[PDB]
Amino acid sequence: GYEVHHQKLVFFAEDVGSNKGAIIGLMVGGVVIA
Amino acid sequence: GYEVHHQKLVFFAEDVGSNKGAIIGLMVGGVVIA
Amino acid sequence: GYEVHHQKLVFFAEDVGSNKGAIIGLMVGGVVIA
Amino acid sequence: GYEVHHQKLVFFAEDVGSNKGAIIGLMVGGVVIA
Amino acid sequence: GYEVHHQKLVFFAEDVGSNKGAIIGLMVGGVVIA
Amino acid sequence: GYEVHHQKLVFFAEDVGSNKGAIIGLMVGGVVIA
Amino acid sequence: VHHQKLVFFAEDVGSNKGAIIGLMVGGVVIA
Amino acid sequence: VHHQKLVFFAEDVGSNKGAIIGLMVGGVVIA
Amino acid sequence: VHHQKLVFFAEDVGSNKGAIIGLMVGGVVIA
Structure with missing residues (x-):
């Protein structure tokens, strides 16, 4: 058997x-000013 | 068997x-001013 | 068997x-001012 | 001055x-057979 | 002065x-058979 | 002055x-068979 | 006692x- | 006693x- | 007693x- 549970x-x-x-989660290229 | 549950x-x-x-979740290119 | 449930x-x-x-969820290219 | 070009x-x-x-790009749950 | 080009x-x-x-790019849960 | 080019x-x-x-790029849980 | 602008x-x-808000005394503001 | 601007x-x-907010005395402001 | 600007x-x-906030006395501000 295979049991997988409770991951986050x-x-x-x-x-x-x-x-x-x-x-930003993912950014191939750019400029961020914060 | 295969049981997978409770992932988020x-x-x-x-x-x-x-x-x-x-x-932004995903951004191939751009400018972000925040 | 295959059982998959409770994912979000x-x-x-x-x-x-x-x-x-x-x-923005996905942005191929642009400008964001926030 | 900002310039952002040629990203893929x-x-x-x-x-x-x-x-x-x-x-599949994004999958929240399920059985994929291949 | 900013210049960001040619990323992939x-x-x-x-x-x-x-x-x-x-x-699969992103999977939250499940059985992948290959 | 900033110049950032040619990353992959x-x-x-x-x-x-x-x-x-x-x-699989990202997996939060599950059984992968190969 | 004299409030103005x-x-x-x-x-x-x-x-x-x-x-x-000009003058706040009580209550709840959720903006 | 004389509050102004x-x-x-x-x-x-x-x-x-x-x-x-100009003058705060009590309450809850959630902006 | 004389408050201004x-x-x-x-x-x-x-x-x-x-x-x-100009003048804070009490309360809760969540900005």
Whole structure:
């Protein structure tokens, strides 16, 4: 048998998030000013 | 057998989120000013 | 047998979300000012 | 002054594609057989 | 003064692709058979 | 003065791709058979 | 006892997406 | 006892996405 | 007893994403 359970992944936050700047998950090329 | 359950993925937040800036998931090219 | 259940994916938030800026999921090219 | 040019993103191939299986960009859950 | 040019991201191949199995960019859960 | 050019990222191959198994960029959980 | 012009703007305000309050005593503002 | 022009802007304000309060005594401001 | 021009801007303010308060006594500000 194969049993897999209860995995997670959190990029920015969990249960409260604020953002006044730039959040990018993936960026091949560019400019970010924050 | 194969049993897979209870996986998640959270990019920005969960249960409360605020944003006053730029959130991009994927960006091949560009300019972000936040 | 194959059993897969209870997966989720949350980009911005869940159960309460605010936005005063720019939220882009995918952007091949451009400019964002937030 | 800002200049951002000539960026590319390639998932599977360019100039020739041949597929006799499964290709998925994003999957939240499920059984993929190939 | 900013100049950002000539960037690339390649997942599987370029100039020739051949697939007889499974290719997944992002998976949150599940059984992949190949 | 800033100049950033000629960067590349290659996951699986370039100029020839051949796959008879499983290729996953990101996985949060699950059974991969190959 | 003498309150006058608590918040004063002298030129354009481009956009308001938040609370501009002159005098706050009680209550709840969610902007 | 004489409160006057607590917050003063003399030219443009481009964007407001937050609390601009002249006098705060009590309450809750969530901007 | 005489309060005047606690916070003074003489040129442009480009963007506000936070609390600008003249006189704080009590309460809760979440900007």
